[PDB]
Design a protein around this ligand. Structure first.
Ligand code: NI
Ligand code: NI
Lengths: 119, 120
């Protein structure tokens, strides 16, 4: 039924070389070009799959996105954050307070890095 | 003049990843494994208060009451990675709610978005 999966992978594939481009283009903010990016050659980027480096920080997006894709993308990525317990919410600079389920043992005020894992 | 809580932040990140991956290679678990599992390096002498947990197959590593410059130093060595739909002024990710961001202008409403902080 659902192989918006290959479309999810294309966006993440695309977000990766976007990030690697930033690493060597400091102080930039763009849509780099598809030449300059280094993408497979055999990979043909669905116009509608866009990108932007801003201050530094890759954003890859799909503006009129097929239902199923939100899910397909979230699932092929992990997610990785840093902050401090306050209170029950994760407090992270540059990102405001995020409310994750903070397991029982992390004290208020601790420093905390989080990471998820696919399927 | 200078602290290398940066060594400590690095040890945290390093411990974290040993949980990340054991967490996978051992599905259905809720921490809080002892470091004999994990398979940590010979040389590494974990300093409690470096604590770790798992909840869902997601893991956390945490210093229970922090030293100073440690959040920063750690946020730095990480990067950061979210995905979610743009509801406007916001990035809605259905496990961490709506996370409010500096979201570029050209990314318009309702767009699905993968975000990979460039740690600089
Ligand atoms: Ni670097
Ligand atoms: Ni897997």
């Amino acid at each position: 039924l659902a192989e918006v999966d290959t479309l999810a992978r294309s966006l993440l594939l695309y977000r990766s070389r976007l990030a690697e481009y930033a690493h060597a283009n400091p102080g930039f903010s763009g849509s780099p070009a598809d030449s300059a990016l280094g993408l497979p050659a055999w990979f043909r980027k669905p116009v509608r799959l866009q990108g932007y480096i801003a201050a530094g920080t890759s954003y890859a997006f799909i503006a009129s996105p097929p239902a199923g894709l939100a899910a397909a993308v979230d699932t092929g990525t992990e997610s990785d954050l840093v902050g401090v317990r306050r209170n029950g919410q994760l407090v992270t600079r540059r990102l405001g307070a995020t409310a994750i389920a903070l397991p029982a043992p992390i004290p208020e005020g601790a420093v905390v890095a989080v990471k998820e894992g696919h399927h």
